[PDB]
């Protein structure tokens, strides 16, 4: 009883989000917008042909498929230039959405969707599983500062894993552990990559988007590593059909708060 | 300005204790209980000789020497059958303790220490790292409830890791996996094992004291890996260590509360 318009659907995210919300049930309105250069266009997704709009009179397009479609919720995968445009745009129409657009004013994006009072998940990171592991890290250097106090800290990140922006994300695991007592990036290239384990090699495979981080003992007796791998976008498909889940079921209670992120999603468990 | 006597100095944990001690300034009491066969016996270690006594009069040989060491705190690391003994010889005494010693009497264990009002730190795990890792997993399980629902779990460790109880530790660890919404332990015996990364080998390094967590996605495309490896038994008295500072503090401070674990002293910060 759900249904979604994907802003993005002709690039490679907003097709895997296609793809999970269509695997969970969510039906896809076969309406979007798009930029100039997309008006017009048909996207082929999933057996799914959604037609994208440019900017030509959007705020009564989208009304009018708000009006056909009251379950709407829109799922924004665009450009930096178009998160306020679009976030103004949901307002001024009362579509709640999820956004996990990166960049743009992000200061006026929460200004303009507090001040429009829409319901709506924002979150740059939509791994959930990997915001989880951050989240973890945060409390436990939270509640435990020094802890490895002395210990040495190598990370590795490669190529795919930086572009993706999860810099934001490991830049906030490494200051996790500088509060757990560390002092403190390799930017990795080959589908292999070493590391010293109590004075012994270790190959890992660092090949799509690859995060390492290694921990060593003062006295190299000790080594802790976490380590995650992503292939393609599924994950981040899988997260943002959560974050819908979740909105819709915050919609229909009619809950107070109305701007959310994936730390909220999280603590209401799977859906 | 603190002074330890550890008991079990004849021990490959009792002469890891006695360095680390030694290497933070702290006093090493050359005098030591033991078992009848240990007793009469001299204990060379990190340039201490230090004396074992047996059984006979114990409580009285421990009170002359607390008499002399009003400063004394005592480490024990002995054996399962002596840590109720033990307990109660501290309580009768009166001379605060931190110990590491695994099994007996748990319950009993506890009973006797609360009764006696004595200072004490006891925890069965002391590389506190460990348990800091193992706190976070807790955490993290506890806030999101289903976060890797769906996910399968692989978990390996080592013969020396099984055996120097890390699989209370884990047990504990899979138990927040479990929680997290995951379905579920091979104990290896190479230097080293291979897992599946995106469809492609990866090889660990699974020598000394290895554990190896593992989740893997339903489409494959997501893996997470933690480990941690260690050689010898220097974490584990550097964190005896810290429990001995953790406890001088309490003492100094007459802190109401009087028995202590691993995460309280985590919670005090680096000493």
């Known amino acids: 009883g759900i249904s979604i318009m994907?802003?993005?659907?002709?690039?490679?995210?907003?097709?895997?989000?296609?793809?999970?919300?269509?695997?969970?049930?969510?039906?896809?309105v076969p309406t979007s917008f798009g930029s100039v250069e997309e008006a017009g266009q048909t996207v082929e997704v999933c057996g799914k042909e959604i037609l994208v709009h440019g900017p030509?009179?959007?705020?009564?397009?989208?009304?009018?498929?708000?009006?056909?479609?009251?379950?709407?919720?829109?799922?924004?995968?665009?450009?930096?230039?178009?998160?306020?445009?679009?976030?103004?745009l949901y307002?001024?129409?009362?579509?709640?959405?999820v956004?996990?657009?990166?960049?743009?004013?992000?200061?006026?994006?929460?200004?303009?969707?507090?001040e429009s009072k829409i319901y709506a998940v924002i979150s740059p990171q939509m791994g959930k599983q990997v915001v989880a592991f951050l989240a973890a890290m945060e409390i436990m250097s939270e509640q435990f500062p020094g802890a490895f106090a002395g210990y040495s800290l190598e990370v590795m990140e490669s190529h795919q894993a930086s572009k993706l922006d999860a810099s934001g994300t490991a830049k906030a695991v490494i200051?996790?552990?500088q509060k757990l007592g560390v002092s403190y990036i390799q930017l990795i290239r080959d589908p292999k990559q070493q590391i010293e384990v109590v004075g012994v090699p270790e190959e890992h495979v660092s090949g799509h988007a690859f995060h390492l981080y290694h921990l060593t003992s003062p006295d190299k007796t000790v080594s802790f590593e976490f380590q995650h791998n992503v292939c393609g976008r599924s994950i981040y498909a899988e997260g943002t059909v959560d974050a819908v889940l979740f909105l819709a079921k915050k919609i229909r209670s009619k809950a107070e708060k109305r701007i959310y992120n994936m730390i909220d999603v999280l603590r209401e468990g799977n859906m």
Chains 1, 2 share one sequence.
């Open 91 to 97: 307002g001024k129409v009362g579509v709640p959405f």
């Open 56 to 88: 030509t009179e959007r705020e009564k397009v989208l009304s009018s498929v708000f009006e056909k479609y009251p379950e709407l919720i829109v799922v924004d995968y665009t450009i930096p230039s178009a998160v306020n445009d679009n976030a103004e």
């Open 6 to 28: 994907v802003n993005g659907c002709s690039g490679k995210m907003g097709k895997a989000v296609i793809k999970a919300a269509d695997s969970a049930g969510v039906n896809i």
């Open 175 to 177: 200051s996790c552990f």
């Open 99 to 114: 956004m996990g657009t990166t960049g743009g004013d992000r200061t006026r994006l929460y200004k303009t969707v507090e």
